[PDB]
Design a protein around this ligand. Structure first.
Ligand SMILES: N[C@@H](CC(=O)O)C(=O)O
Ligand SMILES: N[C@@H](CC(=O)O)C(=O)O
Lengths: 585, 585
RNA sequence: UCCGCGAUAGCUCAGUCGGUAGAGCAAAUGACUGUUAAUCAUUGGGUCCCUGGUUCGAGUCCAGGUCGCGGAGCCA
RNA sequence: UCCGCGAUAGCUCAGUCGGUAGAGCAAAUGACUGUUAAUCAUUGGGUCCCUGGUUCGAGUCCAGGUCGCGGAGCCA
């Protein structure tokens, strides 16, 4: 039916006649000559109409925006003073022999025009015309191209595209599970998976050497800019491989992927320990595009008159880190206050600062209310260590380790972006050597990866001082965002029971919830380790998108609702009763 | 860590030493020589041990079934009288230099041996060792290879791998939807999709010319041998194409797929109308491997003494079809009774028959209680038309059209398999020219495809006598099973509202449930049509599997439960209350 | 919801007439240099799906219930 | 659950001091042979998120509620 795509009309097609189908982007009427910009998946082309055939002209005057039309005409090499740079087929035209309106179109709620600041609620309510926009279309086509490349790579390296079930068993240890009432088992529920974890491990026990799957995952947690309740994840699991082999394969994949699509190269991936990343960046996912760095300085603030410093400086559970931000002594007190509230949202009691103006003048030349409570010597070697000179300002996080790490960690990236201090485009890295556990506002512990992660120690050295236990885990970080990660799994069962005990799971749940896991571990489980990628975030980075919603066909709002389909919706009492449940108002 | 896979040890590797990791399939102990059959993803190999290195021997005597071991040895060209035909590396051996037990294994509940009639409940409860069996593994690897080929094809033809959301809006027209309580919208529910239908259509409106997706689909309906509650489906949708183009592309895909994997060719796909398929096979999915055929014969039974024949023979709403099954006059009355009950389960009041023994002897020579109520002439031309001779038997379905179609339709395939009358291996075909609607035990109508299917007539000729309306639908059938199908969609909105009205959906639901559809249709929807494949059934056919559960990693039971993970399970009252619901006992 | 079949050792299953528990395989131990579904011997192993009822007595009979398989309904 | 920002024509938004509704764009109509974000003119277009309360009077003020965005909690 169609001869060629509009956005694929080259100069070589001159003289030839073409039949193209598509939408009417915009129409320009001069009376004696009518212009149409016809759009399809490949781009836009221009069709011109003269009244020598007044019927086609009549079918050109009635045509409005976003009409679905089929045009047959001749490819005319357009004049030199009429060539369009933006249009890929802008050095060419089509004289319209015959036009047909395949379908009419009502006026599009928002324009598909250059720089129209719609308007995300409206773009989501009419997502089916929002994706008409070449930008969105390019993003989605890019996502498809990406998954194409990844699938190709993983297939070429002996991985098996295996599907794992969505309807699974509900357990109360991981993230909040979406529940599905069972019609056949009243009082029981299915649960949507956060990850095909247990299943992929079983597939390793099953003898499949290498498994991969681009799988749907579901978390009933609240949303954020890079977090959706329903997210697609690139699952990978292998047998008889250590962490070096795994990070090797996955890194190789990411490199090949970035070279196939964006055609970029990454030099090398720095392996950074968790401790270091927390020490000098205050984040488990450092943004290495920002040269700003946290520097410990509490060693010089032990016997100082200022008490909010010497407090945690002598407290082993906390620290006092400094943060030099350059040329910013000229900061208005307004901005300082904004930053103090900002570090406030992460738990910081306040935000001490030192404005450096003249270091040659000693204590004076250092504008700050704090400069009085700190001796000149300590002060000077602090400014020396932090690398500050005239014009800079040094912020201070002095509190519990977690608090200063989080507050200065976030302040770092914030003032990093606010001053545009990004030093490179792509900053890939590996965060390695994690702790095995962490405590959550309470004596309760939780694995910072997942309870199936292999510890470095033995099952005896684990239930004794679990805090000194390291995990065989590893995360991949790109431009401050977590591309993904994984770990080497437990296969000793005894060990698995050890970490299950230390996490508060007694043998009741061990048998009832994770019984099949222990079983599979006892019936000959091989050394296996894996990794997962957040496909959504990956595409968000590769496109350069602001939000995850920009790289998802039909995303959801912060309340996990879809404005286009009005989901979630109401269900009649019949189907509700059939699932053996009642509501409550 | 591993040098080579066990099942990839060729003769060329002779002399070379290899390190292979895997499971211990079975062990044979002769005392002075120990034999191990080591298995991995590629197959089995044999490792031999002599006591000249008694430590490795000690690590060979302790080893039992399904132990996870790593063996380093030398590839020895085994003697001629010891070569194994079944084993791919059976003309070779490995003398074990050093062995290491990577992990021990408890005795496998069922054996992984040749012809052990386990035992599907046990195979499902321990699915992680069931998939160790080379057969299951081969099935899954085949499935992966299939999806690989399909993805490759569709990608090569300008289709876009786009993901559609799982959490959608609940509607009460299609199949029973699985519901998901909303934590943020109390009293409202999400619903798992039966198909990405509306979404794929929106993606057609969105300007993406060609879309495909291997998507998860969910139906809360009871199960069968080829029906699961959670099934994977190959979704396809295109714009600006008619049914001929679509059936062309999809058929081309299936051909290429069958040639890439099984390396078979299909001659041509016969296009059979719905009416014909129902007339001479009594099924919308004919098994063309069975030469047995239904033949209308009611025209000869108008004024006959037998009343169960002449009843429906004069009734326009019903018919009298005959079914000749050859050489089966020798059938025991037991088998006849079994068949009568069998056609009984499909609504047939009974099952009249004629045993043909001697046609030269006239009415006698025809053993039957019915032969008395039917004149000799009519009888004889019936036997002539049905093609019966001495030794054959002719069954009769005389009832309402639906009843005889279903009962004889099923009897046909049953006696087709029971007598092994399969004439070819692959019988591909297209069933085309469906009716638009059908009534369900009630004045209520339902589209036999789906309410978005394009009718052949106009929106006026549709609300008037809807029974004379044909759909632009098409199904692909292989060996009697439905591989899939699709149709050309509605884009007139007026038409969509017409079929929505005739299906009992008032403008209330039209606005509330399918509002976004009508909207998208009004804002410039192109002529689009699509198709979907049941990937599960496809793999079931290509493998030659008995059940769908054989080609699914972790399938479910007839009550939609998983015996391995004990799903569905119970959830604590906290998470239950958080989703704003209560149970009832 | 309906029809039909089924549940006994780790696995496949027999178990009569209602009379108080068996085989093969597997496992553990033993012997053996060439088997490849190794052979051979010794030994261990029971919530007869659950719950009740009739019996002096229940794997066996009755009733209800649970689970697994095929089908009908259902599967736009 | 908490912090912050936000809702006015189809779209982007102004709306003062509480005084009874506006712009640009879009649409419909008109003119024009060369524009490419065409130009120009005429005309149409309001559930000021919802619900109440104070006022002679509410887009404006108060209270509760709904929705959308960023973040905290949360996200094994
Ligand atoms: N599924 C894990 C990663 C893995 O175990 O591979 C996660 O999402 O953190
Ligand atoms: N999704 C439809 C087929 C299609 O519309 O393509 C079905 O399952 O019957």
């Amino acid at each position: 039916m169609r001869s060629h795509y509009c956005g694929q009309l080259n100069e070589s097609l001159d003289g030839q006649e073409v039949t193209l189908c598509g939408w009417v982007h915009r129409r320009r009427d001069h009376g004696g000559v009518i212009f149409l910009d016809v759009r399809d998946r490949e781009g836009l082309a221009q069709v011109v109409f003269d009244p020598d055939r007044a019927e086609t002209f009549a079918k050109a005057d009635r045509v409005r925006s976003e009409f679905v039309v089929k045009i047959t005409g001749k490819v005319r090499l357009r004049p030199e003073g009429a060539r369009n740079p933006n249009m890929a087929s802008g050095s060419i035209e089509v004289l319209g022999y015959e036009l047909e309106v395949l379908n009419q179109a009502e006026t599009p709620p928002f324009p598909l025009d250059e720089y129209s600041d719609v308007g995300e609620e409206t773009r989501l309510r009419y997502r089916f015309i929002d994706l008409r926009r070449p930008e969105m279309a390019a993003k989605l086509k890019l996502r498809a191209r990406i998954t194409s490349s990844i699938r190709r790579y993983l297939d070429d390296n002996g991985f098996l595209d295996v599907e794992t079930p969505i309807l699974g068993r509900p357990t109360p240890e991981g993230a909040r599970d979406y529940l599905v009432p069972s019609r056949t088992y009243p009082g029981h529920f299915f649960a949507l998976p956060q990850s095909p974890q247990l299943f992929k491990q079983l597939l390793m026990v099953a003898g499949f050497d290498r498994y991969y799957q681009i799988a749907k995952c579901f978390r009933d947690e609240d949303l954020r800019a890079d977090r959706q309740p329903e997210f697609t994840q690139i699952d990978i699991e292998t047998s008889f491989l250590d962490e070096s082999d795994i990070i090797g394969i996955t890194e190789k994949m990411v490199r090949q992927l970035f070279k196939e699509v964006l055609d970029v190269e990454f030099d090398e991936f720095p392996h950074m320990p968790f401790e270091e990343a927390m020490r000098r960046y205050g984040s488990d996912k450092p943004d290495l595009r920002i040269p700003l760095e946290l520097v410990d300085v509490a060693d010089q603030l032990k016997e100082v008159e200022f008490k909010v410093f010497s407090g945690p400086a002598n407290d082993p559970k906390g620290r006092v880190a400094a943060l030099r931000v350059p040329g910013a002594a000229s900061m208005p007190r307004s901005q300082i206050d904004d930053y103090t509230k900002f570090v406030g949202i992460y738990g910081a009691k306040g935000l001490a600062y030192i404005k450096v103006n003249e270091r040659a003048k000693g204590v004076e030349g250092l504008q700050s209310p704090i400069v009085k409570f700190i001796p000149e010597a300590n002060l000077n070697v602090i400014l020396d260590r932090v690398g500050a000179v005239d014009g800079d300002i040094v912020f201070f996080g002095a509190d519990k380790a977690k608090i200063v790490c989080d507050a200065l960690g976030a302040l770092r990236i914030k003032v990093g972006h606010d001053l545009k201090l990004l030093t490179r485009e792509w900053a890939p890295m590996w965060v390695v050597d994690f702790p095995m556990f962490e405590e959550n506002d309470d004596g309760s512990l939780s694995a910072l990866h997942h309870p199936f992660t292999s510890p470095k120690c033995t099952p005896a050295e684990l239930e004794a001082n679990p805090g000194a236990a390291l995990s065989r885990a590893y995360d991949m970080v790109l431009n401050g965002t977590e591309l993904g990660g994984g770990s080497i799994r437990i296969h000793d069962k005894s060990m698995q029971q050890a970490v299950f005990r230390v996490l508060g799971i007694d043998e009741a749940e061990q048998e009832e919830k994770f019984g099949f896991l222990l079983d599979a571990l006892k019936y000959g489980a091989p050394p296996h380790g894996g990794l997962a990628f957040g496909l959504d975030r990956l595409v968000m980075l590769m496109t350069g998108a602001s939000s995850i919603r920009e790289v998802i066909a039909f995303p959801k709002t912060q309340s996990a609702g879809d404005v286009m389909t009005q989901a979630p919706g109401s269900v009649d009492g019949k189907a509700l009763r059939e699932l053996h449940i009642r509501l409550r108002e």
